[PDB]
């Protein structure tokens, strides 16, 4: 109920009209990577055999020498958060109208500034699928966010289980 109608400008609007949801576009493509991750299942009866980094047997190729720290996790991790600061640097150097430097004077006549630099530009369909995805990630994704030690084995009865520990 946060979007229960409220918000003015640079904070209110400004932060969000595309901006934060245009950054919540990442959320969806993360949940495109993650819903490029979960689809390990998605297709039943599939051909698999095996992989794929499962429960730690011996990483990439063991290295000719004692693995750096220990575990596959820290070696693949440490890098990820430096080689992707690439994008946000570029994504956090913009402005919406014309670009020069920190120029003369450009606030408002007609045309009214602009719109999220990358506005809707129409196609108000990204958002209709956006909050649709957000509502999912946050929502009944908690169908698999509680006690999911098991997996898929439905056996006929009904649906739902009320509340309980």
């Amino acid at each position: 109920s946060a979007p229960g109608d409220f918000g003015f400008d640079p904070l209110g609007l400004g932060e969000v009209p595309a901006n934060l949801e245009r950054y919540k576009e990442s959320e969806l493509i993360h949940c495109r990577w993650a819903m490029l991750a979960v689809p390990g299942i998605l297709v039943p009866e599939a051909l698999g055999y095996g992989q794929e980094w499962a429960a730690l047997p011996g990483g990439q190729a063991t290295y000719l020498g004692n693995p750096v720290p220990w575990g596959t996790l820290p070696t693949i991790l440490a890098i990820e958060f430096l080689a992707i600061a690439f994008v946000e640097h570029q994504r956090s150097m913009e402005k919406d109208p014309e670009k020069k430097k920190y120029p003369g004077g450009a606030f408002d006549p007609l045309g009214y500034s602009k719109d999220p630099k990358k506005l809707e530009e129409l196609k108000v369909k990204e958002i209709k699928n956006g909050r649709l995805a957000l509502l999912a990630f946050v929502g009944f994704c908690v169908q698999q966010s509680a006690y999911p030690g098991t997996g898929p084995l439905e056996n006929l009865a009904t649906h739902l289980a009320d509340p309980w520990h």
């Binding site: 750096v68 720290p69 220990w70 820290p74 430096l82 600061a85 640097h89």
Partner: protein
């Protein structure tokens, strides 16, 4: 179990972000501006602050971590030595 040098690796992540500027432009301390002697009026009650100067080496010396932190931490600090060891020196891999 504990990556102990997970994080001492980690903290001199950042204070080498400190080896910084003793070197590169001009003097020390962006030369003592205001320290001793007492900038009037402006040291007065105040200044300066600037939400606009978190760049400069964000990109360059964000490598400083992986320096010592790589090949000089878990991978046996400088094996390429020899340079006057007889009143002793060595120095010898506790690792």
């Amino acid at each position: 179990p504990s990556l102990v040098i997970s994080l001492s690796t980690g903290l001199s992540l950042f204070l080498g972000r400190f080896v910084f500027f003793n070197f590169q432009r001009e003097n020390m301390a962006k030369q003592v501006p205001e320290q001793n002697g007492m900038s009037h009026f402006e040291a007065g009650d105040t200044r300066a602050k600037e939400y606009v100067s978190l760049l400069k080496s964000n990109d360059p010396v964000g490598f400083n971590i992986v320096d010592v932190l790589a090949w000089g931490s878990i991978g046996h600090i400088v094996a390429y030595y020899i340079l006057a060891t007889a009143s002793n020196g060595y120095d010898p891999s506790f690792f």
